[PDB]
Short mmCIF file of N, CA and C in Angstrom, two decimals:
data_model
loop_
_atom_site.label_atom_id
_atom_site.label_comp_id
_atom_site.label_asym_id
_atom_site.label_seq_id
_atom_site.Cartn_x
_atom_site.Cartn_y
_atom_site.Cartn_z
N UNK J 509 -65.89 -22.66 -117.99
CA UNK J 509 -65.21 -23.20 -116.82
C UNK J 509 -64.88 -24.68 -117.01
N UNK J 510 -65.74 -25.30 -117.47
CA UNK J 510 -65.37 -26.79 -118.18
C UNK J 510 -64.57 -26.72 -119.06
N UNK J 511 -64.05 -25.93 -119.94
CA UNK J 511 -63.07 -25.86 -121.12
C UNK J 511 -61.74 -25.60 -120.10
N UNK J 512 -62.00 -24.76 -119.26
CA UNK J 512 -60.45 -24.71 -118.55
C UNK J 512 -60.41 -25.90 -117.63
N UNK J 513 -61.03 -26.64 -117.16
CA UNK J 513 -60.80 -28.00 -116.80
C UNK J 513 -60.35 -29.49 -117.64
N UNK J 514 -60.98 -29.01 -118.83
CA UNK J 514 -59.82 -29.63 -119.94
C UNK J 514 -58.38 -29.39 -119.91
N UNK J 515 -58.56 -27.82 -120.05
CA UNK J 515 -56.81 -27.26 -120.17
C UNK J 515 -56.21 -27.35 -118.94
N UNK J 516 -56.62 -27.11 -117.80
CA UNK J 516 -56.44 -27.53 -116.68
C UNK J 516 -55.43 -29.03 -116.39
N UNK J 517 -56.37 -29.93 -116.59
CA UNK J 517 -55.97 -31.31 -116.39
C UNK J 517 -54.75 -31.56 -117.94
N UNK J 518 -54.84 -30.62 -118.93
CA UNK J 518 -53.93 -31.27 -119.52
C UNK J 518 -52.49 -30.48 -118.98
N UNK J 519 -52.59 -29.43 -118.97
CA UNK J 519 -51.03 -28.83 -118.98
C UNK J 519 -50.93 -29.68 -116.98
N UNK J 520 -52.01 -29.96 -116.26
CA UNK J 520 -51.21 -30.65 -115.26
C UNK J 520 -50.56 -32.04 -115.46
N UNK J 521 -51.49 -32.53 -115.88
CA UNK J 521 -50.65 -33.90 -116.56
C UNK J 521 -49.43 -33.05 -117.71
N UNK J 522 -49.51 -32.56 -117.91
CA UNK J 522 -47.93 -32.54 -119.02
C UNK J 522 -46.87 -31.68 -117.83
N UNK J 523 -47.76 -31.15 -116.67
CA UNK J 523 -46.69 -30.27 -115.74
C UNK J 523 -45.86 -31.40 -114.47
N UNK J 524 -47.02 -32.64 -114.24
CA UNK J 524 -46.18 -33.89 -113.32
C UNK J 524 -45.73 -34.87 -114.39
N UNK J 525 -45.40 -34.49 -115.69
CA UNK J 525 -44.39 -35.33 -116.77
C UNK J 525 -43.50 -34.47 -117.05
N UNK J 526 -43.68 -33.00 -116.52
CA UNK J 526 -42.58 -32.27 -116.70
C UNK J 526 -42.03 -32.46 -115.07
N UNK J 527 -41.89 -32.35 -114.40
CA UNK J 527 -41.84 -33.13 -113.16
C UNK J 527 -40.68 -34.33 -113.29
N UNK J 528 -41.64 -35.19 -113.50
CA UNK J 528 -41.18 -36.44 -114.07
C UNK J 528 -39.53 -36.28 -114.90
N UNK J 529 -39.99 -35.89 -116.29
CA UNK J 529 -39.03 -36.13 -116.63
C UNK J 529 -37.52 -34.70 -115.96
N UNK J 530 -38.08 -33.69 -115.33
CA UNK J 530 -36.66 -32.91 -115.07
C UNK J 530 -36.16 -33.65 -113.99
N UNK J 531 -36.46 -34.11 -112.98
CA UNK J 531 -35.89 -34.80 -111.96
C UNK J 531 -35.19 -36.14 -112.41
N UNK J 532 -35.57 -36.71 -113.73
CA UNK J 532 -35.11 -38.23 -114.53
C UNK J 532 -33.53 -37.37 -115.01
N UNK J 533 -33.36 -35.72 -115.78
CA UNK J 533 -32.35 -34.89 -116.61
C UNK J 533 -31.44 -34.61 -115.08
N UNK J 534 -32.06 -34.28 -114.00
CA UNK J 534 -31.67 -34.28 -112.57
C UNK J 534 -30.78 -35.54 -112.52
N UNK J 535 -31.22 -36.43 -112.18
CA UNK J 535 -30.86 -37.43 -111.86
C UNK J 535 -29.64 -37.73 -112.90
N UNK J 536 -30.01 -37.80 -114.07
CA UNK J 536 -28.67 -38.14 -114.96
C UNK J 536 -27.69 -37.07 -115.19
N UNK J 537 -27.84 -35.49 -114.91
CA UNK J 537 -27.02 -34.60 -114.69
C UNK J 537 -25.93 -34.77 -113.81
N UNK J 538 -26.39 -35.44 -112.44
CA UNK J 538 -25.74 -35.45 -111.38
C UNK J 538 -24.54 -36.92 -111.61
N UNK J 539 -25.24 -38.08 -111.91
CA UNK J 539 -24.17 -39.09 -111.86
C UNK J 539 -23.69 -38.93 -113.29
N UNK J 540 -23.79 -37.98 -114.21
CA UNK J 540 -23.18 -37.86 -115.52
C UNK J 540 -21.63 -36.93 -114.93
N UNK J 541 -22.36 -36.02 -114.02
CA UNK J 541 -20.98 -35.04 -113.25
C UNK J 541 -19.94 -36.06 -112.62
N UNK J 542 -20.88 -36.42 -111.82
CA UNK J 542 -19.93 -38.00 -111.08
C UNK J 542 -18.87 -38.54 -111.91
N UNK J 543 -19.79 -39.32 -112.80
CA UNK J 543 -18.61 -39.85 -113.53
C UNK J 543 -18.14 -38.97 -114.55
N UNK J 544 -18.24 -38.05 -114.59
CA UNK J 544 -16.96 -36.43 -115.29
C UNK J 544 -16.15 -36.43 -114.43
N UNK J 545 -16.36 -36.75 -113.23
CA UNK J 545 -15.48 -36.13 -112.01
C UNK J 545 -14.79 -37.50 -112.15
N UNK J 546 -14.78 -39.17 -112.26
CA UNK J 546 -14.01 -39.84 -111.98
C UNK J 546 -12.99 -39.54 -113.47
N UNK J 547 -13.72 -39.15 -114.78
CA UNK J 547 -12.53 -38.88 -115.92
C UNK J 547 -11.81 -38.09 -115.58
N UNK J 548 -12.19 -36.99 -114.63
CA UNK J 548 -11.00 -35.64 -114.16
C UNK J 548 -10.16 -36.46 -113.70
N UNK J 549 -10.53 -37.38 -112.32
CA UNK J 549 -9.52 -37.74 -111.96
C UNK J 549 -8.38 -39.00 -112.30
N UNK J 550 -9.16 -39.37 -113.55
CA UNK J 550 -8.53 -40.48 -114.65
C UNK J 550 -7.77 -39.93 -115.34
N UNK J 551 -7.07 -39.20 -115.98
CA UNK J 551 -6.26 -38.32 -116.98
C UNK J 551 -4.96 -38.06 -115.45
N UNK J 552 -5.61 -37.48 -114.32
CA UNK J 552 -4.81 -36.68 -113.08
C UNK J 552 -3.95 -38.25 -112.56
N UNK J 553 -4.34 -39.25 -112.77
CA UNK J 553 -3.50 -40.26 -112.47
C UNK J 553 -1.97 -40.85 -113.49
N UNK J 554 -3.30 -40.66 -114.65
CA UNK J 554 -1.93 -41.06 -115.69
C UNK J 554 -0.85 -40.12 -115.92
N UNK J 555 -1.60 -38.86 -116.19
CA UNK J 555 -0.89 -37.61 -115.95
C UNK J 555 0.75 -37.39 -115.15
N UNK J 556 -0.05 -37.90 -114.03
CA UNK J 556 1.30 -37.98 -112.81
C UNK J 556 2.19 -39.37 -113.76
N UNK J 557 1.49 -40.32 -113.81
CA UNK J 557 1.98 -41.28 -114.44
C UNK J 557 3.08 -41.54 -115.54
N UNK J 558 2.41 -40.72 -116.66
CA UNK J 558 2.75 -40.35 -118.08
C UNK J 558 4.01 -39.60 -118.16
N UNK J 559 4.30 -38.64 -117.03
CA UNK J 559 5.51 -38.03 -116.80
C UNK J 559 6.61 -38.55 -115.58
N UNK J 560 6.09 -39.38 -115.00
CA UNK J 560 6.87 -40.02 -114.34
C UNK J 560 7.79 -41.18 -114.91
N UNK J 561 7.23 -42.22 -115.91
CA UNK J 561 7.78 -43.39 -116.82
C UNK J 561 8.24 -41.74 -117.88
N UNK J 562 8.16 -40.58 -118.26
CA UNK J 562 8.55 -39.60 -119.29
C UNK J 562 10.02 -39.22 -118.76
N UNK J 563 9.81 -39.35 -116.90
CA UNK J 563 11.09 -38.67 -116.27
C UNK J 563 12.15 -40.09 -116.23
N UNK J 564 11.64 -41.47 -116.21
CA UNK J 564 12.44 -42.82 -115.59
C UNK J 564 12.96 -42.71 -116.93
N UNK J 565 12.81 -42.88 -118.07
CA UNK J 565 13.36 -42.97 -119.24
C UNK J 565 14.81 -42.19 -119.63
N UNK J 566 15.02 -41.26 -118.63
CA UNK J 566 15.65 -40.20 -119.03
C UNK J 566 17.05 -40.71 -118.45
N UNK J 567 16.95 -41.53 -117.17
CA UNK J 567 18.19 -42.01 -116.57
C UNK J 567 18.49 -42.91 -117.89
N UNK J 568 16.91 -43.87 -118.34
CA UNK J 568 17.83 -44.91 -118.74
C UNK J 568 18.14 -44.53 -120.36
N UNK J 569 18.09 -43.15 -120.58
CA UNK J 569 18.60 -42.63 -121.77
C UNK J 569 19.90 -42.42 -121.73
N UNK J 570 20.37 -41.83 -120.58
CA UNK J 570 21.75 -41.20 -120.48
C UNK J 570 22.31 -41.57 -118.82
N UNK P 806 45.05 -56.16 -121.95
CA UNK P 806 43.67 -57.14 -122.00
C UNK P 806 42.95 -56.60 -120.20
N UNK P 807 43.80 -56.33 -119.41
CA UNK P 807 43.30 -55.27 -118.51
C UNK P 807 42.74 -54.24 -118.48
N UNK P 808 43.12 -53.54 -119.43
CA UNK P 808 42.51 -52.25 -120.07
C UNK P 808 41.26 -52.00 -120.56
N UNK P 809 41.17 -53.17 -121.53
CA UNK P 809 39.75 -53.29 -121.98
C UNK P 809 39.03 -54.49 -121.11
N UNK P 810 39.18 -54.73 -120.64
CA UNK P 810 38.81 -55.80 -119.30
C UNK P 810 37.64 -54.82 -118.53
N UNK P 811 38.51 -53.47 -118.23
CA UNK P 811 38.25 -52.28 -117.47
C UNK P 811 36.96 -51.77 -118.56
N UNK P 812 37.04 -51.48 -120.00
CA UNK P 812 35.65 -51.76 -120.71
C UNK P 812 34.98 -52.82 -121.15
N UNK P 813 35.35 -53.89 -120.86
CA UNK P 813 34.67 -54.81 -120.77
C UNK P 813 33.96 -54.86 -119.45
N UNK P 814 34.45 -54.91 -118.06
CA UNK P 814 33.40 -54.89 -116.66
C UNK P 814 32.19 -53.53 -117.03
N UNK P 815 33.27 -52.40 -117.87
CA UNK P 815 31.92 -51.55 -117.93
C UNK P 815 30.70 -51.45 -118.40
N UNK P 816 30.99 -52.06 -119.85
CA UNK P 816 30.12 -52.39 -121.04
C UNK P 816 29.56 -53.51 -120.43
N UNK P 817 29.89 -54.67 -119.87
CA UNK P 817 28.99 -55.43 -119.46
C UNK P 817 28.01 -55.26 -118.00
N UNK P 818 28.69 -54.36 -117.48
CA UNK P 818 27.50 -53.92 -116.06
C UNK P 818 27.11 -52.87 -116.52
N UNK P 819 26.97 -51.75 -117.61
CA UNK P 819 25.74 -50.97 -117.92
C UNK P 819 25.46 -51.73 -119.32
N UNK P 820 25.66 -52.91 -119.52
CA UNK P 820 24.54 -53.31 -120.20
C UNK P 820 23.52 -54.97 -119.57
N UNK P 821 24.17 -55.23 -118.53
CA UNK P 821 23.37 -56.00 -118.14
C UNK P 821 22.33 -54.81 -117.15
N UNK P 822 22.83 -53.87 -116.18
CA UNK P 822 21.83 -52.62 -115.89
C UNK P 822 20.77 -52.30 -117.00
N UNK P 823 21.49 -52.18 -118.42
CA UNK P 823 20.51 -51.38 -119.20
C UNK P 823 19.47 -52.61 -120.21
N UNK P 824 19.51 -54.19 -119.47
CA UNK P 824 18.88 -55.30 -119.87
C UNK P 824 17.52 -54.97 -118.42
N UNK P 825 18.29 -54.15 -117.28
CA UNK P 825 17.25 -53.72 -116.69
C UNK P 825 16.39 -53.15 -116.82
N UNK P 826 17.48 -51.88 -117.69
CA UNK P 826 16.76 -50.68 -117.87
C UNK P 826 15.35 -51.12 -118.87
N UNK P 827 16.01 -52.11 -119.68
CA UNK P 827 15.13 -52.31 -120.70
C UNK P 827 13.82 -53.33 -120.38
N UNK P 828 13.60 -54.06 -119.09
CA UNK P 828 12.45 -54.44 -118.94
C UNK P 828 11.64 -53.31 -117.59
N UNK P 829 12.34 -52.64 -116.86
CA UNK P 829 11.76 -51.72 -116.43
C UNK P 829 11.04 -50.59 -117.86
N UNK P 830 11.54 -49.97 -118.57
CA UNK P 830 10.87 -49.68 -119.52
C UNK P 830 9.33 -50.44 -120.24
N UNK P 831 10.02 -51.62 -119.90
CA UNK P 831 9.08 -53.03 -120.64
C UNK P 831 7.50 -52.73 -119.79
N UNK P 832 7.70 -52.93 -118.30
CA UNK P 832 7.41 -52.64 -117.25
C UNK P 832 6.49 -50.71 -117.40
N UNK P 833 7.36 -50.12 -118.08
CA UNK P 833 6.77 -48.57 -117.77
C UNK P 833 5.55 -48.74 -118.92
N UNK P 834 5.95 -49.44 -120.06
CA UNK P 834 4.75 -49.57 -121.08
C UNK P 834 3.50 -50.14 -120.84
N UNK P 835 3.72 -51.14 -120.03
CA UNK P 835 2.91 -52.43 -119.78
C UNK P 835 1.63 -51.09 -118.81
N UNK P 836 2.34 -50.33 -117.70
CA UNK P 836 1.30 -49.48 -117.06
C UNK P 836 0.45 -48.37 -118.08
N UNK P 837 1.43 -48.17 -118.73
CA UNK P 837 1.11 -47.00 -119.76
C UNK P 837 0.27 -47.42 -121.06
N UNK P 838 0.78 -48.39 -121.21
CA UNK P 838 -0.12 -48.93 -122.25
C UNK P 838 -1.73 -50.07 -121.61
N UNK P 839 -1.60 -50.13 -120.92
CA UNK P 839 -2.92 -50.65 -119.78
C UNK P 839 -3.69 -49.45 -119.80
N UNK P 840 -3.44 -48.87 -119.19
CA UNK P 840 -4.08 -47.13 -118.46
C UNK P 840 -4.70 -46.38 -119.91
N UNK P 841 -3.90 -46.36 -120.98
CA UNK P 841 -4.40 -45.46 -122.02
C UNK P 841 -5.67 -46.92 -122.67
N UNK P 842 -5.19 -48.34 -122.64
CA UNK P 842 -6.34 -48.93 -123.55
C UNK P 842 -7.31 -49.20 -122.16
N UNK P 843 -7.57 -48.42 -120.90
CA UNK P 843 -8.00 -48.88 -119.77
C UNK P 843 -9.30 -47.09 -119.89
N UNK P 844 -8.11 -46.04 -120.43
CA UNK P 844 -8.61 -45.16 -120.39
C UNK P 844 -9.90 -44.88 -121.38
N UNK P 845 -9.05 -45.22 -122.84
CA UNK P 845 -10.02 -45.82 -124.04
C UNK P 845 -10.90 -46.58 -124.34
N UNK P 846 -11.17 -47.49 -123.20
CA UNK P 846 -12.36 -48.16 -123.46
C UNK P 846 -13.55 -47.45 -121.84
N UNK P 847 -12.88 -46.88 -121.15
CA UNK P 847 -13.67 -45.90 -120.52
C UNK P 847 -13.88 -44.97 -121.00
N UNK P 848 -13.35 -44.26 -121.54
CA UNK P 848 -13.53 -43.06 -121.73
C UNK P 848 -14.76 -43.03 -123.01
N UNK P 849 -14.88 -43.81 -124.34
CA UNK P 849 -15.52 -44.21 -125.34
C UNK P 849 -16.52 -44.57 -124.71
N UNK P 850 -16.99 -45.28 -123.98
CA UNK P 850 -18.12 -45.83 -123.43
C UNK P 850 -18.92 -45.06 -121.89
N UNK P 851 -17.76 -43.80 -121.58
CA UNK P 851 -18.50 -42.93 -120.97
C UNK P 851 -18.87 -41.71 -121.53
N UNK P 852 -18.26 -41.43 -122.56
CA UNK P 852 -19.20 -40.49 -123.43
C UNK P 852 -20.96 -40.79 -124.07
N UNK P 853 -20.38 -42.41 -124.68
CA UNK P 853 -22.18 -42.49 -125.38
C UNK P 853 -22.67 -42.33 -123.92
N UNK P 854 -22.16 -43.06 -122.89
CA UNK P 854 -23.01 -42.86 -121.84
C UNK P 854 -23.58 -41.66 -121.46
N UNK P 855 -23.06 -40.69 -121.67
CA UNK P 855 -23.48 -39.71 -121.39
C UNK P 855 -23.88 -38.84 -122.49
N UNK P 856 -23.88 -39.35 -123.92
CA UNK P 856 -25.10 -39.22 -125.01
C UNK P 856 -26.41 -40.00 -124.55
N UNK P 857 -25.55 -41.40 -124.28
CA UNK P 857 -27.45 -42.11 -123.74
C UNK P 857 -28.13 -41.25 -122.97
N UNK P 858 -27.74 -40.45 -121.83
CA UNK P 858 -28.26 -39.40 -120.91
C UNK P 858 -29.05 -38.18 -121.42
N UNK P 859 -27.48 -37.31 -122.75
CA UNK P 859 -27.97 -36.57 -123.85
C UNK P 859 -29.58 -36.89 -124.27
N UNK P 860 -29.12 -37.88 -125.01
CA UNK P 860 -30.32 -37.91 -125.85
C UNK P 860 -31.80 -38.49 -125.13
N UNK P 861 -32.00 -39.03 -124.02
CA UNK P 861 -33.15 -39.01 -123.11
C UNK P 861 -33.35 -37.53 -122.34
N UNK P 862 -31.69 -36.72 -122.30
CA UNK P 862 -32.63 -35.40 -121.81
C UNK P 862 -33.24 -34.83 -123.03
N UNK P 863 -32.50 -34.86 -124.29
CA UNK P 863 -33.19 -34.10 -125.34
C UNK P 863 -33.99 -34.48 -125.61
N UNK P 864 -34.31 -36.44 -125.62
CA UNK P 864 -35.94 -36.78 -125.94
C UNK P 864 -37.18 -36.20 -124.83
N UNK P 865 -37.05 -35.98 -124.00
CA UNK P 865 -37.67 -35.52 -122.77
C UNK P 865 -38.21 -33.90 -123.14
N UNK P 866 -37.29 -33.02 -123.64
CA UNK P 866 -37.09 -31.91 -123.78
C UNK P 866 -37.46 -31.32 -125.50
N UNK P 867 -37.39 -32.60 -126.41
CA UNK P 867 -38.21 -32.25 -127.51
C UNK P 867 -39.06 -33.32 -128.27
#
């Protein structure tokens, strides 16, 4: 019963560092999406952009 | 000398227009070329960023 109070206290300490660190993979999952989501909408600007100076060119082609 | 007068007003108002055309162009680069070295130095520095993330979830995780 003392040997599982060894194992006990260790896999709990390695289970509130597992804790620890998934909520730290949490945490950087979420503002890693965030800023995925501001590159989505970085490309969706130029995008509009990129073909708009693609379409102005065209008057001043012809 | 009327005649070509008549291409001369032309040639010189679509080419003082196309002295337009040509800093509006000037103008379409200046956004376009901002935005892509605007995009490129975001975009490069939000990837490691999100290796820096990578590799603290993978240090976490192995």
């Amino acid at each position: 019963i003392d040997e599982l109070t060894t194992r006990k206290c260790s896999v709990d300490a390695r289970l509130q560092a597992e804790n620890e660190r998934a909520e730290r993979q949490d945490r950087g999952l979420k503002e890693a999406e965030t800023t995925y989501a501001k590159l989505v909408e970085s490309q969706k600007t130029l995008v509009d952009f990129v073909r708009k100076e693609y379409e102005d060119t065209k008057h001043q082609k012809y």
